[PDB]
C-alpha cells in the first residue's frame, strides 16, 4: 500500500506546490547562469579560458614532472 | 467470441486483478487539503507580483553580466 507519505500525484497537482515551485526552479536556473557568466566557474575550479590555453612563455602543452613540488609546478604553469 | 472469463479468470477466487491489487492512482488516499489554496486570491496576486519582479530582475542580470 502506502508507507506513510503524501502521494506524488497529489503533490504534483497542487496550486500551493506550483506556486512555491514557480520561483525556486527559475531562481536556481538563473543562479547557475550567473555562476557561469560572471566568471566564477573558471576561477573556482581553475579551468583555462579560451585565451589562457597558451601563454607567451610556453607554446606547448603543460607537463608536470615533480610529485612533491607539484603545487609550485602547477602554479608556474598556470601563470598568465 | 468471449468465454465469459472477463478480464481475469480467477477474479472471484483471489478477489481482484493485478490492477485491483496494486493501484498507482488512488484519489481516496489523497490529502483532503491541497485541492484548495488557503492563501486565496491575495496570495495569488502577491505571487503574480513577485514572479513579474523576479523575471525582470533575472533578465536584467542576465543581460548585464553578458557581453550585450
Amino acid at each position: 500500500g502506502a508507507t506513510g507519505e503524501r502521494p506524488f500525484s497529489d503533490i504534483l497537482t497542487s496550486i500551493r506546490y506550483w506556486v512555491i515551485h514557480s520561483i525556486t526552479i527559475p531562481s536556481l536556473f538563473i543562479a547557475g547562469w550567473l555562476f557561469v557568466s560572471t566568471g566564477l566557474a573558471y576561477d573556482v575550479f581553475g579551468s583555462p579560458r579560451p585565451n589562457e590555453y597558451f601563454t607567451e612563455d610556453r607554446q606547448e602543452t603543460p607537463l608536470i614532472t615533480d610529485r612533491f613540488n607539484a603545487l609550485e609546478q602547477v602554479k608556474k604553469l598556470s601563470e598568465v | 467470441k468471449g468465454k465469459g472469463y472477463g478480464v481475469y479468470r480467477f477474479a472471484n477466487k483471489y478477489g481482484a486483478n493485478v490492477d485491483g491489487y496494486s493501484p498507482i492512482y488512488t484519489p481516496d488516499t489523497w490529502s483532503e487539503s491541497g485541492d484548495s489554496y488557503k492563501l486565496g486570491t491575495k496570495g495569488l496576486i502577491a505571487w503574480a507580483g513577485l514572479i513579474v519582479v523576479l523575471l525582470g530582475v533575472g533578465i536584467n542580470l542576465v543581460i548585464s553580466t553578458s557581453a550585450l
Binding site: 500551493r16 512555491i20 531562481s27 538563473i30 543562479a31 560572471t38 566568471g39 566564477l40 | 542580470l61
Partner: peptide, 30 residues
C-alpha cells in the same frame, strides 16, 4: 561580491517559501 549577488538572489526565494509553508510546517512539528 559575485557570490554575494547569488546569495541576494536566493534570499527572497527562502522568504517566499517560508511565507507559504510556515503554517503546515508548524502543524507538522507539533
Amino acid at each position: 561580491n559575485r557570490f554575494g549577488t547569488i546569495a541576494l538572489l536566493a534570499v527572497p526565494v527562502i522568504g517566499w517559501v517560508l511565507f507559504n509553508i510556515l503554517g503546515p510546517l508548524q502543524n507538522q512539528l507539533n
